[PDB]
Each structure stands twice: as structure tokens, then as C-alpha cells.
């Protein structure tokens, strides 16, 4: 399959394939997203959630959050893809997390990128300055954080002021991945994903992991597209059978514009290819990605 990656790469036709995917991609309506009352719950005019897969808030004033429930029946895995919270949807974001019983949050942007804020400071930065969202009646405390060269693994305690309940949310922050860009390498990327897997945030015992970026379509799409494909190869009895193009189109049935650049699409291929080695076997000395990642 890997040489199959070159032939497309020798032809340098990725832009051709990516535009085909863009053309063949599903086109469902987003009536709720475009309602006037929700003009200010959306970071971008052009990224909105389909009405059919959009997450809904159990609150009764408005139920709109720019979040989509991607559910992959064949792989058995679901993710919640969403935009980077805004100054006013931060309580919605953690409300979404709490209601959906999500255990992990995957952040693929940085609050500030290229001199502009793409996201909100929606998690407290100091153990002593807990955050409290009055509208959704939630309180968020920072517990402990592990910082690596390119990612950070915070540990948050989200608590419901109403029921008095509390949960441990894991925060996986990829701090070096730039908008429309690609991770420094597949080794760096695979390292990250596999850390998310082991935390159990992805296990069906919990809600769906929440994955986001500035708009939660480009970098996040590459994340799930890599994750889901690898998930399939261990399942189908012919790991070569996985069609990366087919899978991306399937996700685009739940959220628009997953994967934002022909390059991102290309990297997605490499990550599965390099990651397939772990799934496939990975020599007589696995754990290699741990060494090659350059974490600290």
C-alpha cells in the first residue's frame, strides 16, 4: 500500500484527489446554525454544523453549540468535533462536555496563532485561579499538567455547582500544530494520538472525546481520520482494505470540510502508513515512536 502512496505522490496529484473529495463531499443543511440568534455562537461564517449531527445543549434558553457528533459505525468510535470556544460559548463548551459525559478534550490549536486569537482561554492556567461559568453553572479547576516539547497533558477537575458532582477531564494540547499546517512529522503525530488512546478517553466506556482546533475541521479532521483508519485495520481482516478517501467522505457526512489542505490530506496518509507499522507489528522492537518523537 505504501508504494501506492508514492505513485500518487510521483504524480503530485494530491490537489486533484483533495478537490475530488471536496466535490464528492456531502452537503447537508445547517438551518439551526444560520438562525440569527446563533450569529454570535459561530466563530466562522463558513464552518457550521449540520442539523442532523449537531450536538444540542440540555439547557433550555438555546440548544445551539457549533459541535457535531461524528459517529463511525464500522470502527465503533465517535468523536465530538467543535470550534474553538468563544468568550461567550465557554460555558456552553463545558456544558457540552458535562452533558455528553466526555472524558478527554483534544486541543489542536493555540489560543493565539499569527497574532490573532483563534480560541478562548477556556481552561484555567493556574491551580489557584479556578474558573467558574455562571451561565452554565460549572466550575473548572486545574489539577496537574505535564509539559512536553510539543504537547501538554493537563488534568482538569470539572465540577457541577448544581448537583455538586465532579469529574476528571484529560486535556491533550498539541501546541506546535499550525493552522492549515502539518505536524513536525508523523512520529510526532502518532506519539500524541497514542497517548490519547492509553488515557482511555477514547474508550466507549465514556462519552465521545471532544476534539477541536480554531474551527475544528482541518487539524481535527486529520486527527480522527488517522485515528479511525488505524482503528479499522485491526478490525477488518484485510488491513489493506481501508480506503482513506472513502473514510474521509464518510466523516464529511457528519461535519463539513474535514481536512483543510491537500497537504493535511497527504500527511493523513503518512500517519496511517507509519502508524500501520505499530498496528501491523513494528519490527522486533516497538516503542520506537516514543524515542523518535523528541518529547523533551
Binding mask 106-145 for another protein (x = CB under 8 A): ----------x-----------------------------
3-class secondary structure, 291: helix
> Is 124 or 218 the residue whose CB approaches another protein more closely?
218
Question: Is residue 248 a contact point for another protein (CB under 8 A)?
Answer: no
CB of 47 to another protein, least distance (A): 5
Q: Work out the end-to-end distance of the chain between its first and last CA atoms, rounded to an integer number of angstroms.
A: 33
Q: How far is the CB of 180 from another protein (least distance, A)?
A: 8
17 vs 138, beta carbon nearer another protein: 17
Dihedral of alpha carbons 241, 243, 244, 250, sign: negative
Q: CA 237, CA 220: separation in Å to the nearest integer?
A: 27
Residue 220 beta carbon to another protein: minimum distance, rounded to whole angstroms: 12
Q: Per CB under 8 A, which region of 41-49, 138-146, 188-196, 235-243 contacts another protein?
A: 41-49
Stretch that binds another protein, among 12-20, 38-46, 88-96, 161-169 (CB under 8 A): 38-46
Stretch that binds another protein, among 24-32, 42-50, 56-64, 127-135 (CB under 8 A): 42-50
The total of other beta-carbon atoms located within 10 Å of residue 256's CB is 20
| 156, 190, 217, 224: residue in contact with another protein (rule CB under 8 A) | 217
Stretch that binds another protein, among 45-53, 55-63, 166-174, 246-254 (CB under 8 A): 45-53
**Shortest Cβ distance from residue 45 to another protein (Å)?**
5
CA dist list (Å): 36 to 50, 88, 92, 105, 135: 16, 16, 18, 29, 20
Nearer to another protein (CB atom), residue 90 or residue 217: 217
With beta carbons less than 8 A apart as the criterion, state whether 175 and 68 touch: no
Angle at 186 between CA 195 and CA 226, to 5 degrees: 70
What are 249's three cell numbers? 467522505
CB neighbour burial string for 194-232, b if at least 16 within 10 angstroms, e if fewer? bbbeebebbeeeebbbbbbbbbbbbbbbbbbbbbbbbbb
State yes or no: residue 74 binds another protein (CB under 8 A).
no
For 160, phi then psi, to 5°, come to -90, 110
Q: Rule CB under 8 A: is residue 44 a binding residue for another protein?
A: yes
Residue 259 touches another protein, criterion: CB under 8 A: no
Q: Which is nearer to another protein, 43 or 110 (CB)?
A: 43
Task: Give the three-class secondary structure for 127.
Answer: coil
Retrieve residue 181's grid coordinates.
Answer: 499546517
**Sign of the C-alpha dihedral computed for residues 199, 105, 48 and 44 taken in this order:** negative
With CB under 8 A, what is the number of residues at the site for another protein? Answer: 12
23 touches another protein by CB under 8 A: no
Residues that bind another protein (CB under 8 A): 43-47, 116, 214-215, 217-218, 257, 260
Amino acid at each position: 500500500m505504501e508504494k501506492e502512496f508514492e505513485q500518487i505522490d510521483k504524480s503530485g496529484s494530491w490537489a486533484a484527489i483533495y478537490q475530488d473529495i471536496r466535490h464528492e463531499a456531502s452537503d447537508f443543511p445547517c438551518r439551526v446554525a444560520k438562525l440569527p440568534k446563533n450569529k454570535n455562537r459561530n466563530r466562522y461564517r463558513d464552518v457550521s454544523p449540520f442539523d442532523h449531527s449537531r450536538i444540542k445543549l440540555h439547557q433550555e434558553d438555546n440548544d445551539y453549540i457549533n459541535a457535531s457528533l461524528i459517529k463511525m459505525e464500522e470502527a465503533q468510535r465517535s468523536y465530538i468535533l467543535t470550534q474553538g470556544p468563544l468568550p461567550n460559548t465557554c460555558g456552553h463548551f463545558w456544558e457540552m462536555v458535562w452533558e455528553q459525559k466526555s472524558r478527554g478534550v483534544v486541543m489542536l490549536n493555540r489560543v493565539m496563532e499569527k497574532g490573532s486569537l483563534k480560541c478562548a482561554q477556556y481552561w484555567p492556567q493556574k491551580e489557584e485561579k479556578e474558573m467558574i461559568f455562571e451561565d452554565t453553572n460549572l466550575k473548572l479547576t486545574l489539577i496537574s499538567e505535564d509539559i512536553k516539547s510539543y504537547y501538554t497533558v493537563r488534568q482538569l477537575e470539572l465540577e457541577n455547582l448544581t448537583t455538586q458532582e465532579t469529574r476528571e477531564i484529560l486535556h491533550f494540547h498539541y501546541t506546535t500544530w499550525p493552522a492549515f499546517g502539518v505536524p513536525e512529522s508523523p512520529a510526532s503525530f502518532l506519539n500524541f494520538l497514542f497517548k490519547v488512546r492509553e488515557s482511555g478517553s477514547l474508550s466507549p466506556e465514556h462519552g465521545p472525546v471532544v476534539v477541536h482546533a480554531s474551527a475544528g475541521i482541518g487539524r481535527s479532521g486529520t486527527f480522527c481520520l488517522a485515528d479511525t483508519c488505524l482503528l479499522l485495520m485491526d478490525k477488518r481482516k484485510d488491513p489493506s482494505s481501508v480506503d482513506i478517501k472513502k473514510v474521509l467522505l464518510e466523516m464529511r457526512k457528519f461535519r463539513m470540510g474535514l481536512i483543510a489542505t491537500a497537504d493535511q490530506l497527504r500527511f493523513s496518509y503518512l500517519a496511517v502508513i507509519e502508524g500501520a507499522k505499530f498496528i501491523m507489528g513494528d519490527s522486533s522492537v516497538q516503542d520506537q515512536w516514543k524515542e523518535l518523537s523528541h518529547e523533551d
